[PDB]
């Protein structure tokens, strides 16, 4: 029959790789000299994710606050939030909860306890971390139990991982 058709939503800071980790999902591309988004794109992309069909909607948003107003109507619908920082930015970090709380209320998640997050420390692939695996997975653990990856969409290191995943949480609920 009909694959399941998933929306996904891709949250974070400027500049954290969310565009990148969407188009290296999809296309299997990478830009080294990506520009801002300003609103939001979603790309459709099939999978089969324990022998089963699926169809991923990934909706990519502009990370920066001036482009909140373009993002924040487009939430409401995901089946799963992507909250996205960089490993080499401790403030992407840390704006982790104010991403979450932001989803909560205009996404209109009736039931937040349970609705599905995962979290990626993306550029994992660069020398100079600023923060590290262990702050991350205990934020993630203290927070609400959310699965924890650390990507890079540069050298593909656990892409398709961090969105099958996103599935399985969907699935599991
Ligand atoms: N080293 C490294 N650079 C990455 C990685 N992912 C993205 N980048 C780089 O980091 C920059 C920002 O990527 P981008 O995908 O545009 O980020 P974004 O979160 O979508 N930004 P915005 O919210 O403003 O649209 C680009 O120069 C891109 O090449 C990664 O895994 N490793
Ligand atoms: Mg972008």
Redesign the pocket.
Known sequence: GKSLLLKVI?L??????????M??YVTNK?????????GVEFLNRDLEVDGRFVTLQIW?????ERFKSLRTPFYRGADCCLL?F?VDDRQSFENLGNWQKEFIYYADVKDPEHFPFVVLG?????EDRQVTTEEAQTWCMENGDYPYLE?????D?NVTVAFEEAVRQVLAV
């Open positions: 891709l974070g800071d400027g500049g954290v790789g969310k565009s990148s980790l188009n290296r990478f830009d080294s000299q990506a520009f801002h988004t300003i990519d948003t502009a990370g920066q996205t960089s993306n550029k994992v692939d660069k990507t890079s969409a540069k050298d290191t």
